[PDB]
Design a protein around this nucleic acid. Structure first.
Ligand SMILES: [Zn+2]
Lengths: 362, 94, 83, 96, 108, 107, 93, 81, 96
DNA sequence: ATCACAGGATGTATATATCTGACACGTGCCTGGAGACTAGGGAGTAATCCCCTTGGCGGTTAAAACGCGGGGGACAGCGCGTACGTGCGTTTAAGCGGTGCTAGAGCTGTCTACGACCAATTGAGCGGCCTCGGCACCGGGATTCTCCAGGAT
DNA sequence: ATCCTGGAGAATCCCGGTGCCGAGGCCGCTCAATTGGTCGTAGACAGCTCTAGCACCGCTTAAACGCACGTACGCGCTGTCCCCCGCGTTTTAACCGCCAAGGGGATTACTCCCTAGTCTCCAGGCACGTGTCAGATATATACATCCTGTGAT
């Protein structure tokens, strides 16, 4: 079952040999924006999260779609859980003698996601008009996760996420998360938890409206670290004797969902599903299968099939726990409707029974 | 072989609320004990004086509150007042 | 009932006389402004404590003792106004 | 046009002001400054005349002592003229 | 007799109340100690304790540690202007100093 | 019934003893105050009192007076290193300052 | 009501040193502030010494020690000499 | 015991100076520095002795040193208190 | 024969000594200094090892603080090198 | 003659593996916290008395504010030379650890001189009163300062 | 440009008298000191345990000591300039004395109720014991900063 998958993986990799220039264009725009933000009193401390890189591709089948995060330090914050959601919080500031320059975004006691996002978009919009060799257009808002979507010439899109950084003990809701103890080790878990966590502007939306000024917890940096340090051996994959298919399985899982979403993007059934769900499911399967020998590259076929099966089980039962926040169900009926899950279930089951033809067809 | 009192046990607990995953050295603990006794004495000392100055035999929550304001700077004093005011408000309501 | 800008009530000659008493012979023009910026801080810290004592006692009028206690605890003491 | 040179009067005044004991800051001006500051903490405050005097003497004593240290800093720099930074240094060393 | 309950728990405090109630009596701070005094104070001591430990913990994390040592207490206290002053005359065993180098001493 | 007799007389002091005893036992210094403590203290306060007044009286004559004023107390204290130190943080109302002029300021 | 002060005792001491010297009301007010300031300090340290050594009673010994900790140079010494005598005599009186 | 002030080595002085941000040290500093340290120690030690003797002890404890330092406007943390 | 220029090492050392927390004065030397001073007040006196350490830490903290103020005075005088005067001025301003 | 660059040299930060002893957690007391109770003194409240702070007026007077001219100090720039910094090689005694001794801290138990406490008596000290004497102020004169001109260096 | 009288011109000291209000002494009285007796417990004292502070020994080795080179720094000297000082004239509001109003501090009398002090009982917290993980140590590799030559400009 691995041979067809290997051909797919090779195809997906080769499509990225062309990117070096695209990454260049993204960098040009990003550096430009950061200069303006640094000139702005509110964003003076802003910088890239994925330090050393101007590109990250969240979607495996979208090589022309870039994702960058602009982080902003908040030296001390008090979180207040929004409506028992375990992932959404109001951000307030603690006692701080010196002037805190983010005061301009406050609304009463609470840091306004709306104000910060509004100004973030404002600064960028005025600033992109100062990009002269490259045409950069700001797209209309569709949410707060990407604070800004930029359209660069006719080839490049950049999703920009603004995040607050907090270098303090992770919230209690994360206490039982990051369940890598039996996979990457308990000591690695502890090391990772000495790192900061992030907060992204995000309204806490419900069926009857939304809470405007909430922020959601983000551990994207840890997710990256795990994927690139997925072994308990660590140099797993730096040598053939330890070549595993974890990374391959994730690309294929992401690719399966992305291909199906692309296939049916017009019927809208799959709009609420994302690579983050796939990636979360993947980490759970890795947790269930902590030994590198359960991911032998030779078993790509069955490893991927088993990954698919787990994802299907999550869809059918409407349950996918956030890897860092176990009480946060990414697949709750409140976030994703059953119709979408039944549709995806059937499409995946069709694909799996036919050796995943959607992988070749476009 | 004498029971010796300290705040080591209480300091640990506070540490857990602010930083659940961290510990503290025996020296840092010794320092925190010196710290608590220093602040305690000052507040109790000033509260004593306020009671004396205003011709009283009793220290109440006010002498403590006023003592806090005089001893602590800026907002630090304020938050201490807010927390104290509350703890009493609740204590007498519980 | 609102007071303002009485910081300039501390006149140039007044500053100089204080400086001269301290043995200062010659004074740069920028001293007058800088000096007031220090006097004021001193007064804010002392007055505030005096008010704090006054409020504790539930009074309105600040007395000499309220001032003396206020000064005392700041690393000094003043003799001749009570005790 | 008979007159004294620069520095002759200044030394003289140093002698005289060191010698006398009265207040050098005018009273009503000072008194108002105290109140202007006080009103920022609370309105409708009142002062006894003895409270105002207590504040004034402490205030002058403070400034005079500050000037003594300021003067030394200027001398250390090999000068006669005191500048804002001689004041700042003196305070910083004191720990203010 | 009714079941006994700790007062610290009742007031929502971690610091001992009964003990403070007692200590406030000695050195003869006053002939008498009011019922709400021990509580008010315990809350204050706890608040300040938390501020120092939290900031020190942050320093410990910056240095990639899992605990507070005397040095972290020093860095936290001094960087925080209000705590700096409250303890402005305190010498911390093994505190070290802040890495402040005067600009005029640096070449360029 | 023995006649009442001032303790100050017994101790050869001018300062009150019974009063000092009273002040010591309250003002919250201790639960108890020993009989000899008030006496020891009264003698100390008296000694220091004499030193200041004696020196101030001398200062009064430098100004050719027969009286002590706040200024004479200031001059008495600051021209005596030990008293100056004991009272080094004391501001004395209407004390003025010593007539000290730095040599570098002079012709 | 009726205030209390040391004005009467200070006045007498002045006569012991300078029989023909008078004193202003302010100088007297200053001397009163002085006496109360020194009293408080010695009493303060004596309180502490008793506490430090886990005792309830202040005796002439705590006062003596307190004097030394507070007074500089020989003032501490001459004060101790005088204190010692006053107690020695009072006891034998 | 005698002249143990010379036990405070030159490097020891410089290192303290460096920690204070001192970049260059005049050759006459070493003696001047000692003349200050010694005075500091005399005042602190003497108070510690005074407390020790009052208590009728011969061994000076950390608590006697702490009390001695404290009253000079110097609370020291980490040795009881 | 590679060399660093004057001031390069000195700045390096400043960084490091500011960073570390250990005692900079040798112990046995310091310990004896304490005792020599102590014997001038009283013979046959003893110390706990913790008493000696308490003195040493306080002593260094004092000197470091003194050097910081000394350094500022030298800068005020537009110098890099600290001289005995800079120590004396700082102490005086502080009330010593 | 100056800029910057590249190379070397050096020192720092980095990941790695192993060691150990200092923390974190568990057990078993045991004595201080908490509950329950009475007794009575301090703090709270309101009456109300009258002292002192506030506000306002008008006159006068010294003190501030303003402007001008000119000397004198602050400052920048230059050059001398020496007093520190840096690196090398030799000497020192600090630090480690291990041993052995006993002086003095720390705790126990007994007993009694000392001080809190209370009730009675009274005279030392505080408030209010008058008296007049040392000090502050006025005006005049003596002499002791500073500063410039003119004649020496 | 700098030293030495000798005069002119203020400023500061000393002299003698006015007059005033603040100190100093006297009287009433009242309540805080003194006395005298009782109770109980804090502190003095002796005895004993055994921790921990002193003294000594030898070995390892990182710090301290002393010297030589040379150059960045401190110091003194010069000249520019501008910015304070000192004086005189005009303008302001501080100070003084007097007046009236009333707000709030100080004292009084009275009453609970909120605490101290007592006894009983149990669980929260400290001293000890044990196991293993965090940080220290040490090894080795790779990146960053500093300082001379040197060739390009
Ligand atoms: Zn792998």
């Amino acid at each position: 079952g691995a041979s067809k998958l290997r051909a797919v993986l090779e195809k997906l990799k080769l499509s990225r040999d062309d990117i070096s220039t695209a990454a260049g264009m993204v960098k040009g725009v990003v550096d430009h924006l950061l200069l303006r933000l640094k000139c702005d009193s509110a964003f003076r401390g802003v910088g890239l999260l994925n330090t050393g890189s101007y590109y990250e591709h969240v979607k495996i089948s979208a090589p022309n779609e870039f994702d960058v995060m602009f982080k902003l330090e908040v030296p001390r914050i008090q979180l207040e859980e929004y409506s028992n959601t375990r992932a959404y919080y109001f951000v307030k500031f603690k006692r701080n003698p010196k002037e805190n320059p983010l005061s301009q975004f406050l609304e009463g006691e609470i840091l306004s996601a709306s104000k910060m996002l509004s100004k973030f978009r404002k600064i960028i919009k005025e600033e992109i008009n100062d990009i002269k060799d490259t045409d950069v257009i700001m797209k209309r808002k569709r949410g707060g996760s990407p604070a800004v979507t930029l359209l660069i010439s006719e080839k490049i899109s950049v999703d920009i996420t603004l995040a607050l950084e907090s270098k303090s003990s992770w919230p209690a809701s994360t206490q039982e998360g990051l369940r890598i103890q039996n996979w990457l080790s308990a000591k690695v878990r502890k090391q990772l938890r000495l790192k900061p966590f992030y907060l992204v502007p995000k309204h806490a939306k419900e069926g009857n409206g939304f809470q405007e000024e909430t922020w959601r917890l983000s551990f994207s940096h840890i997710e990256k670290e795990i994927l690139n340090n997925h072994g308990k051996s660590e140099t797993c994959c730096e040598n053939k004797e330890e070549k595993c298919c974890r990374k391959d399985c994730l690309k294929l899982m992401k690719y399966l969902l992305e291909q199906l979403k692309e296939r049916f993007k017009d019927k809208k059934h799959l709009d609420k599903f994302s690579s983050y769900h796939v990636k979360t499911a993947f980490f759970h399967v890795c947790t269930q299968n902590p030994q590198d020998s359960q991911w032998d590259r030779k078993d790509l076929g069955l490893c991927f099939d088993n990954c698919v099966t787990y994802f299907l089980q999550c869809l059918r039962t409407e349950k996918l726990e956030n890897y860092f926040i176990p009480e946060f169900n990414l697949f709750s009926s409140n976030l994703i409707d059953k119709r979408s899950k039944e549709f995806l279930t059937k499409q995946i089951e069709y694909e799996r029974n036919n050796e995943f033809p959607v992988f070749d067809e476009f | 072989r004498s029971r010796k009192e300290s705040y080591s046990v209480y300091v640990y607990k506070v540490l857990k609320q602010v930083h659940p995953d961290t510990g503290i050295s025996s020296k840092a603990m010794g320092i925190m004990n010196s710290f608590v006794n220093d602040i305690f004495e000052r507040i109790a000392g000033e509260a004593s004086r306020l009671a004396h100055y205003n011709k009283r035999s009793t220290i109440t929550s006010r002498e403590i509150q006023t003592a806090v304001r005089l001893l602590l700077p800026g907002e630090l004093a304020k938050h201490a007042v807010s927390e104290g005011t509350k703890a009493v408000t609740k204590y007498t309501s519980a | 009932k609102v007071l303002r800008d009485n910081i300039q009530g501390i006149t140039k000659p007044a500053i100089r006389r204080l400086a001269r008493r301290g043995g200062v012979k010659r004074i740069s023009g920028l001293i007058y402004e800088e000096t007031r910026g220090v006097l004021k801080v001193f007064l804010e810290n002392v007055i505030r404590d005096a008010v704090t004592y006054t409020e504790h006692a539930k009074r309105k009028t600040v007395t000499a003792m309220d001032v003396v206690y206020a000064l005392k605890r700041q690393g000094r003491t003043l003799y001749g106004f009570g005790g | 046009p008979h007159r004294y040179r620069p520095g002759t009067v200044a030394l003289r005044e140093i002698r005289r002001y060191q010698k006398s004991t009265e207040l050098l800051i005018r009273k009503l001006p000072f008194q108002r400054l105290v109140r202007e500051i006080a009103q920022d903490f609370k309105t409708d405050l009142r002062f006894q005349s003895s409270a105002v005097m207590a504040l004034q003497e402490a205030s002058e004593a403070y400034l005079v002592g500050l000037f003594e240290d300021t003067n030394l800093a200027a001398i250390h720099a090999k000068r006669v003229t005191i500048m804002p930074k001689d004041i700042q240094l003196a305070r910083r060393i004191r720990g203010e | 007799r009714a079941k006994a309950k700790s007062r610290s728990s009742r007031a929502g405090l971690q610091f001992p109340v009964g003990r403070v109630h007692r200590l406030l009596r000695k050195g003869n701070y006053a002939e008498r100690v009011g019922a709400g005094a021990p509580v008010y104070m315990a809350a204050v001591l706890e608040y300040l304790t938390a501020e120092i430990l939290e900031l020190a913990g942050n320093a410990a994390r910056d240095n990639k540690k899992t605990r507070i040592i005397p040095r972290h207490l020093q860095l936290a206290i001094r960087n925080d202007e209000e705590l700096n002053k409250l303890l402005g005359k305190v010498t911390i065993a093994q505190g070290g100093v802040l890495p402040n180098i005067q600009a005029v001493l640096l070449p360029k």
